[PDB]
Amino acid sequence: SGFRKMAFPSGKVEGCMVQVTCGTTTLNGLWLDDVVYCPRHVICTSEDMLNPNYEDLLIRKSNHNFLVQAGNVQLRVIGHSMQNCVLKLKVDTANPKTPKYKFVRIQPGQTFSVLACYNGSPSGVYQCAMRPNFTIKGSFLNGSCGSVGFNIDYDCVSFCYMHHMELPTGVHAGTDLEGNFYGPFVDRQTAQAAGTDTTITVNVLAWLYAAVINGDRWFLNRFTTTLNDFNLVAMKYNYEPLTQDHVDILGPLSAQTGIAVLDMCASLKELLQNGMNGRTILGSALLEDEFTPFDVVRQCSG
Amino acid sequence: SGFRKMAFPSGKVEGCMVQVTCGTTTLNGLWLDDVVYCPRHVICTSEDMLNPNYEDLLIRKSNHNFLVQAGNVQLRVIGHSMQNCVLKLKVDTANPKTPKYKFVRIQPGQTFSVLACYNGSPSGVYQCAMRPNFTIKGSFLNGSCGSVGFNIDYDCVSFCYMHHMELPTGVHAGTDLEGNFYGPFVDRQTAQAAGTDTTITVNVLAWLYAAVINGDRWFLNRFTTTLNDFNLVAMKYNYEPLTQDHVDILGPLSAQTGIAVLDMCASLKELLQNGMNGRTILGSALLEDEFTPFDVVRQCSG
Numbered sequence: 001s002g003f004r005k006m007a008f009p010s011g012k013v014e015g016c017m018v019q020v021t022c023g024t025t026t027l028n029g030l031w032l033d034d035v036v037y038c039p040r041h042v043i044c045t046s047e048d049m050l051n052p053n054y055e056d057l058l059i060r061k062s063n064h065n066f067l068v069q070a071g072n073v074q075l076r077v078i079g080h081s082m083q084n085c086v087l088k089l090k091v092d093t094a095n096p097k098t099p100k101y102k103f104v105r106i107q108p109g110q111t112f113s114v115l116a117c118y119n120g121s122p123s124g125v126y127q128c129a130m131r132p133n134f135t136i137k138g139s140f141l142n143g144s145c146g147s148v149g150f151n152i153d154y155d156c157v158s159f160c161y162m163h164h165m166e167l168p169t170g171v172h173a174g175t176d177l178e179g180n181f182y183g184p185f186v187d188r189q190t191a192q193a194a195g196t197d198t199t200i201t202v203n204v205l206a207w208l209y210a211a212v213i214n215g216d217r218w219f220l221n222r223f224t225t226t227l228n229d230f231n232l233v234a235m236k237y238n239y240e241p242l243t244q245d246h247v248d249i250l251g252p253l254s255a256q257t258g259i260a261v262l263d264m265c266a267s268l269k270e271l272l273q274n275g276m277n278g279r280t281i282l283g284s285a286l287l288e289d290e291f292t293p294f295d296v297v298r299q300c301s302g
Numbered sequence: 303s304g305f306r307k308m309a310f311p312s313g314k315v316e317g318c319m320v321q322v323t324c325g326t327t328t329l330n331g332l333w334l335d336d337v338v339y340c341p342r343h344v345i346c347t348s349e350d351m352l353n354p355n356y357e358d359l360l361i362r363k364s365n366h367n368f369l370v371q372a373g374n375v376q377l378r379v380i381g382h383s384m385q386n387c388v389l390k391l392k393v394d395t396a397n398p399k400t401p402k403y404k405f406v407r408i409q410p411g412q413t414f415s416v417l418a419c420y421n422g423s424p425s426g427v428y429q430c431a432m433r434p435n436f437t438i439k440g441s442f443l444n445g446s447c448g449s450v451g452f453n454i455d456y457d458c459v460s461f462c463y464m465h466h467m468e469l470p471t472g473v474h475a476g477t478d479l480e481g482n483f484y485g486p487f488v489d490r491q492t493a494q495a496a497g498t499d500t501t502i503t504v505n506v507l508a509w510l511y512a513a514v515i516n517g518d519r520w521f522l523n524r525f526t527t528t529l530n531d532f533n534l535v536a537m538k539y540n541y542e543p544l545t546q547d548h549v550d551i552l553g554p555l556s557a558q559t560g561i562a563v564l565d566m567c568a569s570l571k572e573l574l575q576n577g578m579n580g581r582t583i584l585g586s587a588l589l590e591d592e593f594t595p596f597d598v599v600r601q602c603s604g
């Protein structure tokens with residue numbers, strides 16, 4: 001038994017991380033095939049950061065202003081390009097450690113493993129959720145930019161996030177690997193709002209299912225509810241409205257616990273309404289929304 | 303900014319995990335040099351498990367009863383040995399992916415990265431603390447046995463845990479890599495007590511320091527305390543008694559926050575005494591004791 005925030009093994013992604021220096025700025029790059037991907041603001045000075053014209057700024061840059069290092073090895077850039085908010089640096093060598101990979105754009109409520117790097121060196125790995133407001137709550141210091149988020153499905157790495165910037169609270173924004181920001185963010189040092197974040201209701205139910213499977217049952221109750229009734233007690237508490245896919249996606253967990261999704265929704269209502277009263281579920285004194293149904297199935301089966 | 307439970311990158315350890323089958327039992331092995339290490343209870347039947355004589359049970363086993371697989375490759379065992387509660391299977395091939403490594407026995411209150419495996423395949427990575435009672439709170443299903451816990455210092459893997467068994471609550475016990483159990487546990491399916499677990503006070507202070515560094519200050523208070531006075535309010539609340547090394551180890555964090563350790567101890571007392579009143583510190587509604595001072599320094603500096 002036991003239930004933990006667990007990241008995918010990071011090995012396949014370690015061999016893809018390089019260092020990228022342009023002028024004074026150094027940060028992380030993803031080297032797949034003959035292409036290093038990194039955030040385009042590696043070309044900015046402290047000053048440019050306030051209101052950059054990236055086209056103009058990049059014109060002043062030539063292949064030899066881009067210092068790509070892979071441990072001790074340096075890579076000949078033979079082509080620079082911009083795709084939205086990322087730099088593609090075409091290099092001479094194909095990364096021999098290149099894994100089967102894809103670039104996917106993940107949807108709000110989905111999770112992925114971040115391999116946080118500094119100077120092209122991986123320092124650690126943890127799981128994030130894409131929040132409904134398209135922020136993440138990570139651990140990213142100066143130098144962390146260009147670190148990536150990924151899923152491993154089969155033997156195939158699905159790259160879905162690259163880190164760009166930090167927002168007031170301590171929350172992170174970044175791009176997919178084609179360089180489109182998740183959410184309304186631009187790579188400019190100028191006031192931008194994240195706006196209201198809500199709880200991923202289906203993930204909270206997935207987690208209650210994980211609780212029951214590990215024996216934590218105390219919150220399980222005699223009552224039930226309707227979808228409408230509950231979903232009016234959701235929005236009250238800023239929770240993503242529960243749909244019928246959400247029900248059908250909890251099937252495997254409903255199936256394994258022999259607990260109907262709507263019985264479980266009624267246990268949630270009383271915790272939203274009566275709090276947790278100083279009790280814990282799975283070592284946590286609050287409701288956890290950063291595990292998907294699949295995250296729970298993967299961990300609670302094998 | 304940001305502060306997360308972060309595991310070391312798992313790559314160096316992925317290339318060391320093999321499958322080990324004896325009779326019906328299959329579990330995980332650590333292949334370093336010409337030696338595969340695994341739990342010795344791979345030789346037991348469901349029945350043997352209740353009261354094994356390992357010496358006697360192992361005599362009936364010969365090199366060819368041990369089926370070691372590394373993905374699709376099979377390894378010729380040319381020597382079986384028992385060191386306390388682990389099997390050393392001498393094989394023909396030296397693991398070419400063998401990293402600089404050491405075997406260390408970690409002390410209660412220290413943390414390490416678990417790479418959880420099934421059938422010799424890594425499925426995920428997370429951080430654990432060796433609890434004061436020498437249990438961990440992991441995520442280990444049938445097949446997880448032989449999964450290892452490690453630190454990466456410099457380029458050198460320090461192997462410190464191998465998973466053997468689960469204790470009532472959902473808590474895990476295992477050995478160092480010489481095969482000595484942490485704590486009073488024996489590899490026999492017979493009633494054993496963990497007995498009373500206490501909170502790693504120095505780790506809770508390290509975490510309050512991480513909070514302050516990320517801006518969460520509300521619990522910071524005007525008061526101070528003595529070491530004796532606080533340490534009498536510790537044991538009340540089952541907390542490891544705070545020593546002067548603990549003070550001197552918090553130096554780097556005291557140094558960076560400009561907050562004396564004993565001011566911080568007085569903030570802790572009021573949270574132990576007045577609870578958290580529905581507020582959160584670093585996204586948690588309870589006091590976190592599974593980050594060491596070094597874990598916090600590593601993450602909060604680079």
Ligand SMILES: *[C@](O)(C(N)=O)[C@H](CC1CCC1)NC(=O)[C@@H]1[C@@H]2[C@H](CN1C(=O)[C@@H](NC(=O)NC(C)(C)C)C(C)(C)C)C2(C)C
Nearest residue numbers: 027041141142143144145164165166187188189190191192
């Ligand atoms: C990286 O680029 C890096 N080199 O690691 C860096 C990581 C952060 C954490 C300290 C620096 N990110 C940025 O520098 C990022 C780049 C400029 C400014 N950036 C910010 O993240 C800024 N945030 C910010 O301005 N936020 C709001 C936009 C005003 C909402 C910081 C204030 C955190 C520096 C750009 C192009 C946004």
Ligand SMILES: *[C@](O)(C(N)=O)[C@H](CC1CCC1)NC(=O)[C@@H]1[C@@H]2[C@H](CN1C(=O)[C@@H](NC(=O)NC(C)(C)C)C(C)(C)C)C2(C)C
Nearest residue numbers: 329343443444445446447466467468489490491492493494
């Ligand atoms: C592994 O050996 C494995 N193959 O993965 C396994 C993992 C656990 C999780 C389900 C099985 N561990 C054991 O089988 C372990 C081996 C026997 C019995 N084991 C237990 O962990 C048992 N615990 C237990 O008996 N606990 C107390 C000791 C009575 C305190 C289980 C009941 C969990 C099976 C041995 C040699 C202890």
Ligand SMILES: [Cl-]
Nearest residue numbers: 284285586587
């Ligand atoms: Cl919590």
